[PDB]
Amino acid sequence: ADCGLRPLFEKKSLEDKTERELLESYIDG
Amino acid sequence: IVEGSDAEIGMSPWQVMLFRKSPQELLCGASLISDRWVLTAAHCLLYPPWDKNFTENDLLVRIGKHSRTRYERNIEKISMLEKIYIHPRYNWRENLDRDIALMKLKKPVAFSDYIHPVCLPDRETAASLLQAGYKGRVTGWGNLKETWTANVGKGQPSVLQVVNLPIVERPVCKDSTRIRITDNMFCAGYKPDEGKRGDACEGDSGGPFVMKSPFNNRWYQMGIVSWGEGCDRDGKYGFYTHVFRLKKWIQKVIDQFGE
Amino acid sequence: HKTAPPFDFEAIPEEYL
């Protein structure tokens, strides 16, 4: 139930170098 | 992974290496979905036309890895297998339909900074994210190019590789290949026109295609790397097992045999 | 599964730590 949250990224409040690309794809097209 | 890059450490903590004991080799990728369960493609474990039928004792799962070849003492965990569960309608005879397998670890692994499970999608999440144009991420230690093309030596990566790819409309997937594409597969990759590149390749198969939910900030495994016609060719796309379609089978197995 | 060089992988002990 704690799945999908990466200790080194989401739990600390840090983004990886390319996840932004994914979110842009959900919104821009 | 072709045209990918080095993963940041801990970037994909559900990534699992399916490791052959004798002879020592990377067989496939895989994903950690709970403390006792690992998800992969069936063709990694079973494909009789190449006399392939791995038993539990033939393999090890290695979790928390970053390096391909090294023993990473302060990070990785090695587990043995208790039981392989293959989808009973897995169609190796024709098109690798329902290419999905589960592996029960003999002992539960403790989670860590480097070891942490991916979520499996629900109906809402699947409806929301599995759309043409939307990108997921694929990771693995498979080859950097098709074998026997370009330069041999630089074929295997030093460290885990990651690439992001867009889901492709069903008509284009279908029109891209002669193989019978079913609703248990979807496909991903850039189009020749789109001037970006990338693909899963030999050794990455069985590993996860993941998407990050903007509703709750979680990574969900939407697909399992299944098959392709070569790696990273124009007009070709990678095909992925549609994890949500088969989620009922995954939960049926885990509820029955998860202690 | 079609991916390796010779003497490639570091040996893996039996550790639980």
Residue numbers in the entry:
A (entry chain A): 1B, 1A, 1 to 14, 14A, 14B, 14C, 14D, 14E, ...
B (entry chain B): 16 to 36, 36A, 37 to 60, 60A, 60B, 60C, 60D, 60E, ...
C (entry chain C): 12 to 28
Reported in the publication:
The crystal structure of the thrombin:s-variegin complex was determined at 2.4 Å resolution. Only 17 out of the 32 residues (VHis12 to VLeu28) of s-variegin have well-defined density. The first seven N-terminal residues do not make direct contact with thrombin and s-variegin is cleaved by thrombin between VLys10 and VMet11. In contrast, the C-terminal fragment MH22 V(11MHKTAPPFDFEAIPEEYLDDES32) remains bound to thrombin after cleavage. The present thrombin:s-variegin structure reveals two exciting features: (1) the novel mechanism of thrombin inhibition through disruption of the charge relay system, and (2) the binding with thrombin prime subsites. In the thrombin:s-variegin structure, TSer195 Oγ is displaced by 1.19 Å, pointing towards s-variegin. At the same time, the distance between Nε of THis57 and Oγ of TSer195 increases to 3.60 Å from 2.79 Å, breaking the crucial strong hydrogen bond needed to form the catalytic charge relay system. This explains the observed classical non-competitive inhibition for MH22.
Among them, thrombin (factor IIa) plays significant pro- and anti- coagulation roles. The active site contains the classical catalytic triad – His57, Asp102 and Ser195. Compared to other blood coagulation serine proteinases, thrombin has a prominent active site cleft, which is deep and narrow. Like hirudin/hirulog, variegin targets the thrombin catalytic site and exosite-I. However, unlike other naturally occurring thrombin inhibitors, variegin interacts with the thrombin prime subsites in addition to exosite-I. Variegin has several potential advantages over hirulog-1/bivalirudin: (i) synthetic variegin (s-variegin) contains only L-amino acids, while hirulog-1/bivalirudin has a D-Phe; (ii) inhibition by variegin is about 9 times greater than hirulog-1/bivalirudin; (iii) the cleavage product of variegin (MH22) remains tightly bound to thrombin (about 400 fold stronger than cleaved hirulog-1/bivalirudin).
